[model samples]
Target: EILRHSMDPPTFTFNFNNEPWVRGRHETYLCYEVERMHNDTWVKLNQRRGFLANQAPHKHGFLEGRHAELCFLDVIPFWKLDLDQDYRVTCFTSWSPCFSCAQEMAKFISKNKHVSLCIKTARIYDDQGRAQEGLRTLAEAGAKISIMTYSEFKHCWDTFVDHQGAPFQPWDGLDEHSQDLSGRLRAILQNQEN
Candidate 1:
């Protein structure tokens, strides 16, 4: 798989340089995806992917995340997306997209059935029932989503980020964080039923 991510902040900030996240300062880290083009290059992907991924749908009223006022949903339409070669669009995001973005991406995925989209996020957000349902809708609409784990994080660092030679360190309770995502989702649904 090739690196195809859109970056934001136009540059890497130290806030997300560490593993897991810089406690409480979750300024959405770099998000990315990939398309196979003969002329593909990381420098080119970096110049574009991060910024695009970080774009806030503020115009549609979606906002707030782990660290910043605005956040990256990870799965977005790639202007340069071409349905050639591997025909897969894989996204790596520091945080999962909110419901609105999930629905939007799901629509995009549903429309471009030729391209398979896989989203990996540092966390799953079940902001009550809405968030869980949004992600479920994405699945129903045909986007593969999962929690980003330690190994996956290392891959993103090496493949998408200009890490400046930092080693991948496992964040404390990394698995614990992922382990509860489903519970959180179930709780959200249960609360709605009650």
Candidate 2:
């Protein structure tokens, strides 16, 4: 049997960090816009300044460590899957699969001849050296996707060639990421940058 995940490296930013009101997961039904800088000029413009992690001025968003490893993963849009947005999820010939979540993915890819689909996985966060978030073409709701955990991530383990060769650990429940609701929550806070 598998167990709950334990490794909590650090919360990372999503790909749409710069884009405003772009919803990609289910947990968050709403998304807000982040304003461009109007004060600092030198370095903050070309880089994503480090969040002291818990550097929230008020009760707004999740707290990321000051120096934490960031990670991300594309999730399903619950409402969209239920025809919430017809124009968004119209039955189109262009669709893909996530061949990782043993449950939902298994059902989606179980077809005739053999299982063949354009599936891919992303690093979610480009920090600490691990990829987790993955995106697809069919940008609709209820779409099933798979997200390998820190342990299930062969890329993370195999990335470093230390004394052990590969950081391959025994499989765990984190691989079974078939949650009823997407845990991908997004928070867009506001602050005067001057």
User: Top model by TM-score, which number?
Assistant: 1
- The residue-by-residue lDDT of candidate 1 on 5-120, one tens digit each, is 32333232333344443344233444445545454432224322432334343445455322211222223333434433433455565655556655565556654444545555
User: Native-vs-model 1 lDDT?
Assistant: 0.46
Q: Which digits, one per residue and each the tens of the lDDT, describe model 2 over residues 44-104?
A: 2222111111111234455421110011111112223212221111110011122132223
TM-score of each: 0.56, 0.20
Off by over 4 Å in 2: 1-146, 150-152, 160-167, 178-194
lDDT of 2 at 22: 17
Kindly report which residue stretches of model 1 are placed more than 4 angstroms away from their true locations once superposed: 1-30, 35-51, 55-86, 140-142, 182-194
- Could you tally the backbone clashes for each prediction? 13, 10
